């Protein structure tokens, strides 16, 4: 993989994961999953979070979820795609750059005499 | 002597 | 830590890694390190690549390298900062997003009737 490719796949898994956390909290809502179906969704999601998110970007994990609970998979997919519009890539890129420069500076300063 | 991977 | 923070710190470790690979190849002469100095730097870098670069952008690793071989650490730092201007951040986010949307589409199409 290129470094960019590696990073892309890893971002994809981060988004799937963020999506799972979001849906889990929403299913909880105030004082419990409402419908019997959402209760099922809650339990399936908790089951599936006990398993490592296989597939590039979490896709193997998503497919397994979809087989067990299609309604849940649709929601998880909707949320991770929605998260593409909210994730602050600029901030990320900014932090990665600034902190690289800052760490280099502090390391070099420290070793200098 | 190493396959260096990340 | 935010998802953006998580991603930033992970990128920083990627860059440190890329920098180590770049410098390792540089040091490897045509058919082996040629100078006594490049040989020492080569061996120190090989030794340090057998040790994990923690989840801290690779800074703890860099500090240890700097203690052992200050010349090598300066070059590694120079290369990882330079790489901030080579890494294709736009392509990276573009791939992560498009492939998220494309995987969703393929999964949903497959499950639909």
Author numbering:
A (entry chain A), C (entry chain B): 44 to 156
B (entry chain R): 462 to 467
What does the paper say about this structure?
Our data demonstrate that RbcX-II from the green algae C. reinhardtii functions as a bona fide Rubisco assembly chaperone, despite its considerable evolutionary distance from cyanobacterial and eukaryotic RbcX-I proteins. Like all other known RbcX proteins, CrRbcX-IIa is an arc-shaped dimer with a central hydrophobic cleft that binds the C-terminal sequence of the RbcL subunit. Conserved polar residues at the corners of RbcX make critical contacts to the N-domain of an adjacent RbcL, thereby stabilizing the RbcL anti-parallel dimer in a state competent for assembly to the RbcL8 core complex of Rubisco. The green algae Chlamydomonas reinhardtii contains two RbcX-II sequences (CrRbcX-IIa and CrRbcX-IIb, orthologs of AtRbcX-II) and no RbcX-I ortholog.
Taking advantage of the finding that the N-terminus of RbcX binds into the central cleft, we therefore generated a fusion construct between CrRbcX-IIa and the C-terminal recognition motif in CrRbcL. In this construct, residues 462–473 of CrRbcL (sequence WKEIKFEFDTID) are directly linked to residue Pro37 at the N-terminus of CrRbcX-IIa(37–156), with the new N-terminus of the fusion protein starting with Trp462 of the RbcL sequence. This fusion protein readily crystallized and the structure was solved at 1.97 Å resolution. Difference electron density along the hydrophobic cleft could be assigned to the RbcL residues 462–467 (WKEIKF). Residues 468–473 (EFDTID) of RbcL as well as residues 37–43 of CrRbcX-IIa were disordered. The sidechains of Ile465 and Phe467 point into hydrophobic pockets surrounded by Phe60/Arg64/Leu67/Leu92 and Leu57/Phe60/Met96, respectively. The sidechain of Lys463 points towards the C-terminal end of helix α2 and Asp90. The peptide is oriented more towards helix α2 in the cyanobacterial structure, whereas it assumes a deeper and more central position in the hydrophobic cleft of CrRbcX-IIa. Consistently, density for the bound peptide sequence is only discernible until the first Phe residue (Phe467) in the complex structure. The loop insertion between helices α1 and α2 of CrRbcX-IIa, which is ordered in the structure of the CrRbcL(462–474)-RbcX-IIa(37–156) fusion protein, would extend into a shallow groove of the RbcL dimer surface.
